[PDB]
Amino acid sequence: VQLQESGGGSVQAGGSLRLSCAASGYTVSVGCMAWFRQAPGKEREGVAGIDASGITKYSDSVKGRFTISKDNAKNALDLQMNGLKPEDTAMYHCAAGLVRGSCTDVLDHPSYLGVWGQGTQVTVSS
Amino acid sequence: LCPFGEVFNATRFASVYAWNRKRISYSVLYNSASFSTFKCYGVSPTFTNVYADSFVIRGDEVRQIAPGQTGKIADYNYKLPDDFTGCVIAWNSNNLDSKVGGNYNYLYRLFRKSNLKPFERDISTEIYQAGSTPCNGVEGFNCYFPLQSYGFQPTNGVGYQPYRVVVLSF
Ligand SMILES: [Zn+2]
Ligand SMILES: [Zn+2]
Ligand SMILES: [Zn+2]
């Protein structure tokens, strides 16, 4: 059981990236899963979450630009990131498996997701 | 004479919920200065089959790997019998199993309907029904994934640092 993020790197402001978090031993379809990010020396922020019902929630900072979706062929959670800003530079981190509360608040409660990946760095240059 | 080296010096260790077992069929253990815990039971520390079980737990949980203990680890992850015959060995593995951003790859079981029997292994990932409504394998309120990541960072207190554990039973 593990989550493995990929897709990060460098991108020019205004550009696009797609992150993917491959899940082993964990079925993404029926899971509560979310993407978080942390800029250096700064507080972790929930960016996008999705529940078993397919309902998504986005942080205000990324709404209209990011899309979270489940890839049931690869058993992965994807994050499409458009119109990227230097703002968005951070380590992006995927988590899965609701262990407390409800899926609808996980963007505000990262500890409510039990399983965490290793993170993938995104650096947006101006 | 038993070749324990493959166990103690293995490059990667198992999560405690999916603890590894190796079947094999003693002076080098004492002289190791890296071992921080070394407790033998039912035997004079100074055999048809010996079983070497190995996993990673957190420093303050090593006390649970002993006969007659309780807690998430002893209750839900790895349980020794009251009449245990063997040794428990542990060492701090902060340098191998911690990472600056945090190593989350090691898990333990957080929920279970009953306590493990001695030497029982539970690797199931069934959604845990915390309330009266059945879950049908779907995560949601009162319907929880039963495993939780450890968060190993090298600057954490020693009690929160990762320890590698080897249990030798005879
Ligand atoms: Zn995909
Ligand atoms: Zn993170
Ligand atoms: Zn809340």
DSSP B5-25: HHHHT-SS--BSTT-EEEEE-
Q: A103: nearest CA in chain B?
A: B140
Q: Could you tell me which residues are beta bridge partners of residue A98?
A: A113
B102: left (phi over 0), alpha (psi -120 to 50) or beta: left
The C-alpha of B131 sits at a distance from chain A's nearest C-alpha, in angstroms, of: 12
Using the Cα atoms of residue A32, residue B128, residue B136 and residue B14 in order, give the sign of their dihedral. Answer: positive
Contacts of B72 in chain A (CB under 8 A): none
In a 3-state reduction of DSSP, which class is residue B159? helix
- By CB atoms closer than 10 A (0-12, 13-18, 19+), residue B83 is exposed
Closest CA to A11 of A83, A63, A59, A64: A83
Inter-residue contact B124 to B147 (CB < 8 Å):
no
Q: How many other β-carbons are positioned within 10 Å of the β-carbon of residue B126?
A: 13
- Shortest CA distance to B73 belongs to which of B150, B169, B144, B153? B150
Q: What are the structure tokens assigned to A74, written together?
A: 């690869």
Number of domains in chain A: 1
Q: Hey, are the CB atoms on B107 and A1 less than 8 Å from each other?
A: yes
Which one-letter amino acid corresponds to residue A50?
I
Q: Please tell me which residue of chain A has the smallest CA distance to B126.
A: A26
Helix (H, G, I), strand (E, B) or coil at B94: helix
Domain boundaries, chain B: 1-101+154-170, 102-153
Contact across the interface for A32 and B140, Cβ inside 8 Å: yes
Strands A17-24 and A45-50: unpaired
* Per-residue tokens: B29: 């253990």
Say which CATH number the domain at A86 has: 2.60.40.10
Within B12-120, strands assigned E span 20-24, 35-41, 50-58, 86-92, 107-109
Nearest to A91 among B101, B103, B127 (CB): B101
Q: CA B170, CA B167: separation in Å to the nearest integer? A: 10
DSSP SS3 for B157 = coil
From A62's Cα to the closest Cα of chain B, the distance in A is 23
β-strand pairing of B107-109 with A17-24 = unpaired
Q: How far apart are CA B121 and CA B53, in angstroms?
A: 11
Structural contact between residues B30 and B83, judged by C-beta atoms closer than 8 angstroms: no
Decide if A32 contacts A50 (C-beta within 8 A): yes
Residues of B in contact with A1 (CB under 8 A): 15, 18, 107, 125, 147
**Calpha distance B28→B31 (Å, rounded):** 5
Instruction: List all residues 6 or more positions away from A77 whose beta carbon is below 8 Å from its beta carbon.
Output: A20, A21, A23, A28, A33, A35, A50, A68, A69, A70, A71, A94, A96
CB contact under 8 A, B104 and A115: yes
Please give the single-letter amino acid code of residue B1: L
Written in H, E and C, the secondary structure of chain A is CEEEEECCEEEECCCCEEEEEEEECCCCCCCCEEEEEECCCCCCEEEEEECCCCCEEECCCCCCCEEEEEECCCCEEEEEECCCCHHHCEEEEEEEEECCCCHHHHHHCHHHEEEECCCEEEEEEC
What's the reported resolution, in angstroms, to a tenth?
2.1
Residue A107 CA, ligand 3 centroid: distance in Å:
9
H or E segment and range at residue B97: helix B94-97
Indicate the SS3 state at residue B36. Answer: strand
User: How many Å is the Cα radius of gyration of chain B?
Assistant: 17
Q: Are A58 and A47 in contact (CB under 8 A)?
A: yes
Q: Quick one: CA dihedral B71, B73, B75, B79, positive or negative?
A: negative
Q: Are A79 and A92 in contact (CB under 8 A)?
A: yes
DSSP label at residue B59 = G
Query: Counting Cβ atoms within 10 Å, is residue A73 exposed (0-12), middle (13-18) or buried (19+)?
Result: exposed
The technique by which this structure was obtained is X-ray
The tokens describing B39, both together, are 């407790």
Cα separation of A50 and A32, whole Å? 6
CB-based contact A52:A30 (threshold 8 Å): yes
Which are the contacts of B9, defined by CB distance < 8 A and separation ≥ 6?
none
Ligand nearest to the CA of B141: 3
- Residue B24 near residue B125 (C-beta atoms within 8 A): no
State which residues form the domain around A61: 2-124
